[PDB]
Amino acid sequence: SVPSQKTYQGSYGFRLGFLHSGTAKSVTCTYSPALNKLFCQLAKTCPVQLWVDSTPPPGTRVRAMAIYKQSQHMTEVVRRCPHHERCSDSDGLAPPQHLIRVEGNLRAEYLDDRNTFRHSVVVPCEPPEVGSDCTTIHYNYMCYSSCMGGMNRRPILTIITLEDSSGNLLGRDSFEVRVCACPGRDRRTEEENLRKK
Ligand SMILES: CCN(CC)C1CCN(Cc2cc(I)cc(I)c2O)CC1
Numbered sequence: 618s619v620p621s622q623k624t625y626q627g628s629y630g631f632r633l634g635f636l637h638s639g640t641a642k643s644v645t646c647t648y649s650p651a652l653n654k655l656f657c658q659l660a661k662t663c664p665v666q667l668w669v670d671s672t673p674p675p676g677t678r679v680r681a682m683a684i685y686k687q688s689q690h691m692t693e694v695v696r697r698c699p700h701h702e703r704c705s706d707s708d709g710l711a712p713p714q715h716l717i718r719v720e721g722n723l724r725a726e727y728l729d730d731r732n733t734f735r736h737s738v739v740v741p742c743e744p745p746e747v748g749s750d751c752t753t754i755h756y757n758y759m760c761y762s763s764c765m766g767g768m769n770r771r772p773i774l775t776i777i778t779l780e781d782s783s784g785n786l787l788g789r790d791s792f793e794v795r796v797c798a799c800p801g802r803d804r805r806t807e808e809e810n811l812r813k814k
Pocket residue numbers: 667668669670671672673742743744745750751752
């Protein structure tokens with residue numbers, strides 16, 4: 618099975634937002650709107666914003682899952698490589714196999730799907746802090762795109778779904794991810810390639 622990646626705002630007008638972090642060689646996480654692609658360093662904080670037009674019901678949750686982007690790989694489960702799944706860098710909550718973690722949220726839950734075997738991490742949907750207009754979730758990606766025996770240079774997408782308390786679909790958005798040593802340079806390069814192409 619391949620989970621849908623269709624953008625769907627749904628009844629609550631759900632969509633993601635990203636900061637404008639620039640492309641300096643020192644930057645650790647940066648988003649390209651032109652590529653709809655997040656570039657980040659291994660295990661570093663990735664702020665992702667949640668925006669809605671109206672308040673969803675109590676019990677609404679927000680799930681993140683990775684899938685391979687390319688058609689010939691979309692069916693393979695995205696997981697950490699044989700090295701990283703064994704490096705004992707657990708935060709006490711995330712299974713060591715999971716590529717995507719949520720940072721600093723005690724209510725995060727990690728799912729190994731009993732049928733598809735796909736991994737995901739889900740948290741309660743919460744209102745913005747007083748004074749803010751959106752809610753931010755901090756994600757970590759725990760392997761490099763290049764990890765041998767894992768992603769092995771294959772591009773992935775992160776799919777973010779807004780769910781009701783049963784896990785039914787309320788909204789969906791997605792973005793490509795590259796986990797790399799120099800996100801600033803790589804974003805600049807890929808945006809240049811795009812502009813040329
Ligand atoms: C312009 C948008 N207006 C409506 C007029 C409001 C602003 C206030 N929010 C509250 C709210 C609750 C949850 I739980 C999650 C999120 I993210 C969130 O924004 C709801 C939308």
